[PDB]
């Protein structure tokens, strides 16, 4: 069964002005996704100090890159700490209603939306390249669940059947038509080498036949 809820508005209002704001450097998104999925596996990493167990879900720490031009989808994969059902209903697990208010005080005040992440709201910059995202993600606390939003005021949240995952979050975003150049291997390479060169977890690029 799926179950429908209504974003809080200033959170629809963010997701608008990402949609119909005109700004070409939108390279941004993929670092944002790489920056959540880096702290995501901070957040297990630190948990399995004192609790090694944690790890019983998988061991290695990672994040995949995996284009597809079949289906027009970049998915973003990290076996970080997952979220669970409650995160995934409170914004992805972000204080995304006060952070949204600052953003957009922000960008009163001279702030260009390349500041996005630094409110909290990184992971909304998706939709500058993004028609739909979907949301697969594995919580050791709970069940594999699928979160979508095409925008349009409203989110759902289903229990996944799909592959099991074991412990993270996958990102799959169905790239607008005109925004294909971010599955090619070169265009990808280069804006993780220009923004993504310090993360300290291995990223791996995957191949396509």
């Not at 450097?25 to 920056?35: D, G, H, M, V, Y």
């Not at 500058?128 to 989110?155: M, R």
């Not at 599955?183 to 993780?192: F, H, P, Q």
């Not at 990223?203 to 396509?208: A, D, N, R, S």
């Given at each position: 069964?799926?179950?429908t809820?209504?974003?809080?508005?200033?959170?629809?209002?963010?997701?608008?002005?990402?949609?119909?704001?005109?700004?070409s450097?939108?390279?941004?998104?993929?670092?944002?996704?790489?920056?959540?999925s880096?702290?995501?596996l901070?957040?297990?990493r630190y948990?399995?100090?004192?609790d090694?167990?944690?790890l019983?879900?998988?061991?290695?720490?990672?994040?995949?890159?995996?284009?597809?031009?079949?289906?027009?989808t970049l998915?973003?994969?990290?076996?970080?700490?997952?979220?669970?059902?409650?995160?995934?209903?409170?914004?992805?697990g972000?204080?995304?209603?006060?952070?949204?208010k600052?953003?957009?005080?922000?960008?009163?005040?001279?702030?260009?939306?390349?500041?996005?992440?630094?409110?909290?709201?990184?992971?909304?910059?998706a939709?500058?390249?993004?028609?739909?995202?979907?949301?697969?993600?594995?919580?050791?606390?709970?069940?594999?669940?699928?979160?979508?939003?095409?925008?349009?005021?409203?989110?759902?949240?289903?229990?996944?059947?799909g592959?099991?995952?074991?412990?993270?979050?996958?990102?799959i975003?169905?790239?607008?038509?005109?925004?294909?150049?971010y599955?090619?291997?070169?265009?990808?390479?280069?804006?993780?080498?220009?923004?993504?060169?310090?993360?300290?977890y291995?990223?791996?690029?995957?191949?396509?036949?």
């Open positions: 069964e799926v179950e809820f209504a974003f809080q508005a200033e959170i629809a209002q963010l997701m608008s002005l990402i949609i119909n704001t005109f700004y450097n939108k390279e941004i998104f993929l670092r944002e996704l790489i920056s959540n880096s702290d995501a901070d957040k297990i948990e399995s100090l004192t090694p167990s944690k019983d879900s998988g061991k290695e720490l990672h994040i995949n890159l995996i284009p597809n031009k079949q289906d027009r998915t973003i994969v990290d076996t970080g700490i997952g979220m669970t059902k409650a995160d995934l209903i409170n914004n992805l972000t204080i995304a209603k006060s952070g949204t600052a953003f957009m005080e922000a960008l009163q005040a001279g702030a260009d939306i390349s500041m996005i992440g630094q409110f909290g709201v990184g992971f909304y910059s939709y500058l390249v993004a028609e739909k995202v979907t949301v697969i993600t594995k919580h050791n606390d709970d069940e594999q669940y699928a979160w979508e939003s095409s925008a349009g005021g409203s989110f759902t949240v289903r229990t996944d059947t592959e099991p995952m074991g412990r993270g979050t996958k990102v975003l169905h790239l607008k038509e005109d925004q294909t150049e599955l090619e291997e070169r265009r990808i390479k280069e804006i993780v080498k220009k923004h993504s060169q310090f993360i300290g291995p990223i791996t690029l995957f191949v396509e036949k």
